[PDB]
Amino acid sequence: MWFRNLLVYRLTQDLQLDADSLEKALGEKSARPCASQELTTYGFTAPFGKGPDAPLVHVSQDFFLISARKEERILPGSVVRDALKEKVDEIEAQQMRKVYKKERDQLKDEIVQTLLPRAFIRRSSTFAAIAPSLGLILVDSASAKKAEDLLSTLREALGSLPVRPLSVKVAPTATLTDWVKTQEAAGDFHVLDECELRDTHEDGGVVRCKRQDLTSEEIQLHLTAGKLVTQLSLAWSDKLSFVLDDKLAVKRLRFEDLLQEQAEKDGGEDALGQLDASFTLMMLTFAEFLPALFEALGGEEIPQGV
Amino acid sequence: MWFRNLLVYRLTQDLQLDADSLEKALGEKSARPCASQELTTYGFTAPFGKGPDAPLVHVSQDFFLISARKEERILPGSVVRDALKEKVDEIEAQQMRKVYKKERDQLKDEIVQTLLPRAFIRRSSTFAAIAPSLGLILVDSASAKKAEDLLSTLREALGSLPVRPLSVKVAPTATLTDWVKTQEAAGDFHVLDECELRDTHEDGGVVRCKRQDLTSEEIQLHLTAGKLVTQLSLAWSDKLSFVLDDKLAVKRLRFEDLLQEQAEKDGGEDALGQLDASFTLMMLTFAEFLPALFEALGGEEIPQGV
């Protein structure tokens, strides 16, 4: 279980939690199949394994792994409109009358409800972690929206979830810019070959760099021209590489082969064994990487306007 | 109608072409609804005009507008796979055995056969303009594949279609790079604020700029550093604007208001009348734009006979 995206949240109180108290709490807001006239359903499901007996929560060295599945019937607006048109055409030919705006919007609703039951279902899962030992909650997403849903749904299956989005002392963009400007980042981090530079005004310029030597005079000119680094490729030690933007979102999280081949040797031949070891070696790697990141970004922060 | 993209094709020989002769032929290759067990269909349709007796070709002077429609069933690979992991369970909890490679492979074909008929349909169009008195066929698409699909069905429908994609005497990328470098484009063309730059060497880099002044030291330094212009946002005269790539694909085609408004003031009250006017005017301006484009790019590389 190697996360691909990371969104860090601070446990403000690190209030106690039990594997049993949690597991049955998550059952109250579980995942159910989407009804025939239902657009969407959101609820927790078994992270690993699955099968009406598989646990919603998963533990290892005091680390928990939960997951919230979402079901939504796929009914593209494209399909609706084509169906609308065909019906309208049918009425005007068979009833010899013109169907106007008001009535077509009415027939639209009628069409949506006739098509839903026939709409395939899309299943998307949003994994999250809870390391009370680290005092944080880690979501495997890039979308803050999706992260809110997971946390907002966990907020119901708990009644109380004291958590705030990670925040750093110094604005990231300033820290990222400095790193590229000076061609050196905080201890152990390495500026890779990708970034996104941009002017500060809204309709300002935007420059995207792939496979670029970020130490070239070319990049420098963008910086002295006013552009700021809003996205940056970074590696940490020799453990993993990822992309960091100016909202602290960790995207394209990729752990090195050495670490993957490693953890894969703590599960041996079975599936649940291989997964458990991965979520473990990852969480353990996160224990040293995450704090080092906070220090790299110039110390973590604690807000006031709760 | 106003094209949103443009790929040009040169007729390497004279095309017989009689309106009704062409209209007849396209009917032999007309669009048809998707069979409940069918994946996709592809054929011609009335570019303008609804009803089953609406013409497949629209004539304005010596310009012929045609259209190909593709119908496709929405079978998200996602739903096809999710169906198995559900089919397998039943078998394994009742037949004291595991499901293997060739078995699952079989069950997949049966799932498809069952789900296809229930799938919603997605329809998409591609308009093509045939200008005999110019020896060109203009396809309203950014994708060369889409165009080849239109040209192939047209060749199938007509018996033969002697055309080759446009090519010019000087490497486009060299010309586009030269325009940015010298800060001057060839007559009536203007360099806008967007471009894609890329290294000459293997796995080299890519720099994408938008809302950027291409005359700034930043862009200049990228070029002296070796980057080539592979895509450039341009305006022609005061009539249109577009993005030109190094494969000669004319993308994001946009016509100026005074031009579109003029087709409205010449088209009347009815839609079809508007559609005819804009189609006419578009072709009329293309007839000025295209040759000036070829010349600007160093002249067209004319395909020689034997």
CB atoms within 10 A of CB A36: 11
Identity of the residue in A122, A205, A225 whose CB atom sits nearest the CB atom of B78? A122
Point out the residue among B118, B121, B218 whose CB comes nearest to the CB of A222.
B218
Interatomic CA distance for residues A134 and A10, integer angstroms: 9
Q: Give the helix/strand (H/E) hosting A235.
A: strand A228-236
User: Could you tell me if B217 and B108 lie in one domain?
Assistant: no
Examine the domain organization and report whether A120 and A246 are in the same domain: no
The DSSP H or E segment spanning A69 is strand A63-73
Resolution of the model in angstroms: 2.5
Is B212 found in the same domain as B144? Answer: no
Q: Which residue has the tokens 């604005």?
A: A171
Residue A299 and residue A296: Cα distance in Å, rounded? Answer: 7
Q: Are residues B133 and B196 in the same domain?
A: no
Q: Using the structure block, give the residue that is written with the tokens 């299943």.
A: A123
Instruction: Check CB contact under 8 Å for A119 and B120.
Output: yes
Residues in chain B: 306
Q: Which of B35, B39, B42 is nearest to B74 (CA)?
A: B39
Residue of A206, A210, A221 lying closest to B218 (CB–CB): A221
Give the span between the Cα atoms of B133 and B131, in whole angstroms: 6
Q: Does B210 lie in the same domain as B118?
A: no
Alpha carbon of residue A70 to chain centroid: 14
Residues B216 and B118 in one domain: no
The CA R_g of chain B, rounded to the nearest whole Å, is 24
The single-letter code of the amino acid at B108 is: K
Report CA-CA distances (Å) from A163 to A132, B135, B172, B277.
12, 67, 55, 61
Which domain range does residue B207 map to? 169-306
Instruction: Say if residues B233 and B194 touch (Cβ distance below 8 Å).
Output: yes
- Nearest by CB to B206, from A199, A210, A222: name it: A210
The verdict on B30 and B154 lying in the same domain is yes
Burial class for A203, CB neighbours closer than 10 Å (0-12, 13-18, 19+): exposed
**Domain final residue pick, A134, A168, A202:** A168
Let me know if A177 is exposed, middle or buried by CB neighbors in 10 A (0-12, 13-18, 19+).
buried
Q: Which of A115, A133, A168 is the last residue of a domain?
A: A168
| Distance in angstroms (rounded) separating the CA atoms of residues A75 and A119 | 6
Nearest-neighbour CA in chain A from B176: distance (Å)? 19
Alpha carbons A273 and A281: distance in angstroms, whole number: 12
Least CA distance to B116: which residue of chain A? A120
Buried b (16+ CB within 10 A) or exposed e, B72-86: bbbbeeebbebbbee
**Dist. CA A33–CA A40, nearest whole Å:** 9
**Antiparallel, parallel or unpaired: β A228-236 and A240-245:** antiparallel
| Pairing label, strands A7-11, A121-131 | unpaired
Q: How many domains does chain A have?
A: 2
Cβ neighbors of B11 (< 8 A, separation 6 or more) are B132, B135, B136, B137, B162, B163
Chain B interface includes A77 (CB < 8 A)? no
Burial A278-305 (b: 16+ CB within 10 A, else e): bbbbbbebbbebbebbbebbbebeeeee
- The structure's method of determination equals X-ray
Q: Which of B94, B92, B89, B88 is nearest to B107 (CA)?
A: B88
Cβ atoms of B139 and B6 closer than 8 Å: yes
Contact (CB<8Å) B218/A216:
no
Q: What Å distances lie between residue B293 and B9, B109, B171, B228, B236, CA to CA?
A: 14, 50, 14, 20, 9
Instruction: For residues A297 and A186, state if they share a domain.
Output: yes
Cβ distance B120 to A79 less than 8 Å, yes or no, reads: yes
Q: Which of B99, B133, B168 is the last residue of a domain?
A: B168
Are A114 and A142 in a shared domain? Answer: yes
Based on the domain organization, do A213 and A272 belong to the same domain? yes
Chain B CA closest to residue A213 = B205
B39 touches A at CB < 8 Å: no
- Within an 8 Å CB–CB cutoff, is residue B76 touching chain A? yes
Element (H, E) at A241: strand A240-245
Whether residue B101 is found in the same domain as residue B32: yes
Q: Are B295 and B163 within one domain?
A: no
**DSSP codes, chain B:** ---S-BEEEEESS-----HHHHHHHHHTTB--PPPTT-SEEEEE--SS--STTS-S-EEETTEEEEEEEEEEE---HHHHHHHHHHHHHHHHTTSSS---HHHHHHHHHHHHHHHGGG--EEEEEEEEEEEGGGTEEEE--S-HHHHHHHHHHHHHHHS---EEE--BSS-HHHHHHHHHHHT--STTEEEEEEEEEE-SSTT--EEEEES--TTSHHHHHHHHTT-EEEEEEEEETTTEEEEEETT--EEEEEE-HHHHHHHHHHH-SSHHHHHHHHHHHHHHHHHHHHHHHHHHTT-B-PPP--
| Pick from A99, A83, A82: nearest CA to A91 | A99
Report the distance separating Cα A304 and Cα A292, nearest Å. Answer: 24
Q: A164 touching B, CB under 8 A?
A: no
